[PDB]
Amino acid sequence: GITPNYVGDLNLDDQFKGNVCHAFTLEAIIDISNERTVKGVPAWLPLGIMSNFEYPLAHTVAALLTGSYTITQFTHNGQKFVRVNRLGTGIPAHPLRMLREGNQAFIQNMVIPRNFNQFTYNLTNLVLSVQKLPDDAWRPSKDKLIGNTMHPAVSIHPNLPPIVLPTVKKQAYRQHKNPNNGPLLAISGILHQLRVEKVPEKTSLFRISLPADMFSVKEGMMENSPVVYFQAPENFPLNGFNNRQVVLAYANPTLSAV
Amino acid sequence: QQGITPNYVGDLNLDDQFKGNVCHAFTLEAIIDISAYNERTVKGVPAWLPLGIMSNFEYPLAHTVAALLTGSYTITQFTHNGQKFVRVNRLGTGIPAHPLRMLREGNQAFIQNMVIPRNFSTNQFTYNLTNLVLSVQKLPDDAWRPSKDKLIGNTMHPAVSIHPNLPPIVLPTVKKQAYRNPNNGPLLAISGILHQLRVEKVPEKTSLFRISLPADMFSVGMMSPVVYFQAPENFPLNGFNNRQVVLAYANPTLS
């Protein structure tokens, strides 16, 4: 296995400010290999976004940087995946899948370039990026995060988890008598107008500013515009966020991956 | 430059962070590129940099480890009273009261001749950190360690300076049965067997040495008394003979 080293703007003196969020990402160098092996392919592996109240930060960070990691491959429902493994015992209930379950899978085509089905991989180098999300990040309320309720969310790409959204203002679906539909219909109505922009001077991080006339920030954390941040690989193309759909997803991070 | 952060290697178990009686030896292991400012050439050189030994009760372990592994480090040189030092710096703000100097003060100095080989000691040479690893090793069950109040206190105690450029090793209390004017017994008793003490390198551990102490002289303290101490992994075994008895603070904030 291989352990990472660190890069980021994280401040441990704020470990007790529960409303500080970090995006966590592994950045990897991978050597690929019967014929000549290719050395130095970089890849970007989001592990999650967490706020300090969800789990002690120092443990989280210590646990991540003390881990030895491995990369493996597997097929699932006829779809090629890549699993990065953190060796040894996980930690229960942990918001981030890597520490919780002791591994994290990615669709291969989100890590290995598409000129690669007869190739094996391994980690040459590993860096753990920890970046504080800006203060304008909207984030689900504590009870939604610990609950098992599902909420309106936007699937921005089929291979990224859906982005749970703030609550939709009653005013935005006046007409609709059905309240388990209303929010959903209102969202699909502007789904295709939403603009994804890359967050600058941050790696692997994107955001969507949402219309205020539709979305309320009353239910979140951290008098300002509703905006959601999400993680995608640093090299992910901007034109690749067009296959959108509206769904109901869990906010509770312990109930979303495969 | 801007700095570099370390990688981890060790046997530390975070699940024991709340067992206050677990001790870790903390050591930076470095690769250092040395270069004559006139020459293009570079050679690289490993070095072992002890930062301290801490028990879990002295400070939350996870903060300690997270703080160490998140730090960006640099190496610099300075002279003080004519003799040459090397300072490894951890960039940014400190952690006040922290047992380990590196986190507490944001830097740690070493005599140059305990980092850089003779031949690279001169002034035409500049040093850069190329690679950094943080070793964290749990000391074995038998480690003797000063009591909590001596560690928080203001008092000095009998200690052995095993080499002039390593910090001294505070010792357990000397049994009244072992000595006699009356506030020397401890110090005199120690010097009396100082040169019979045998330093052994700890096996399956880096940068770590121990001394078994006679029980008839020393009284006991975690899971015969034994003290562990840190020296560079490549420190020579014939180099623990220049010994002296001194008084040192047990409180690691005072050093």
Concatenating the DSSP letter of every residue in A14-77 gives GTT-TT-EEEEEEEEEEEE-----EEEEEEEEEEEEEEGGGS-HHHHHHHHHH--EEEEEEESS
CB A3 within 8 A of CB B131: no
Structure token pair of residue B4: 């570099």
Structure token pair of residue B69: 């592994």
Structure token pair of residue A97: 């899948």
**CB burial readout A156-180, b (16+ within 10 A) else e:** bbeebbbbbbbbbbeebbeeeeeee
CB A126 within 8 A of CB A68: no
CA torsion angle A230 A232 A235 A238 (round to 10)? -60
* Cβ neighbours for B122, distance < 8 A, ≥ 6 positions apart: none
CB contact under 8 A, A65 and B8: yes
Min distance B118 CA to chain A CA atoms (Å): 31
End-to-end CA distance of chain B: 29
Structure token pair of residue B140: 């074995």
CB B112 within 8 A of CB B32: no
- Which residues on neighbouring strands pair with residue A46, listed in sequence order? A25
CB A218 within 8 A of CB A167: yes
Domains of chain B: 3-152 (2.70.20.20), 153-252 (no CATH)
Is A4 an 8 Å CB contact of chain B? Answer: yes
Residues in B closer than 8 angstroms to A5, CB to CB, are 4-7, 69, 132
CB B53 within 8 A of CB B64: no
CB contact under 8 A, B14 and A63: yes
What type of residue sits at position B252? P
Looking at chain B, which residue has its C-alpha nearest residue A59?
B62
Task: Say how many CB pairs under 8 Å bridge A and B.
Answer: 57
Neighbour tally for B224: CB within 10 Å:
10
Method by which the model was determined:
X-ray
How far is CA A64 from each of CA A3, A90, B33, rounded to the nearest angstrom? 9, 10, 29
* Cβ neighbours for B251, distance < 8 A, ≥ 6 positions apart: B150, B151, B152, B153, B154
How many Å separate Cα B107 from the centre of its chain? Answer: 14
CB A87 within 8 A of CB A68: yes
CB contact under 8 A, B63 and A8: no
Question: How far is the C-alpha of B227 from the C-alpha of B234, rounded, in Å?
Answer: 20
Question: How far is the C-alpha of B179 from the C-alpha of B217, rounded, in Å?
Answer: 9
Structure token pair of residue A177: 């008598």
Residues in A closer than 8 angstroms to B93, CB to CB, are 13
CB A82 within 8 A of CB A108: yes
Q: Is the dihedral of CA B218, B219, B224, B226 positive or negative?
A: negative
Is A93 an 8 Å CB contact of chain B? Answer: no
Question: How far is the C-alpha of A145 from the C-alpha of A202, rounded, in Å?
Answer: 25
CB A235 within 8 A of CB A27: no
Q: Best residue in A2, A3, A129 to probe B by mutation, most B CBs within 10 Å?
A: A3
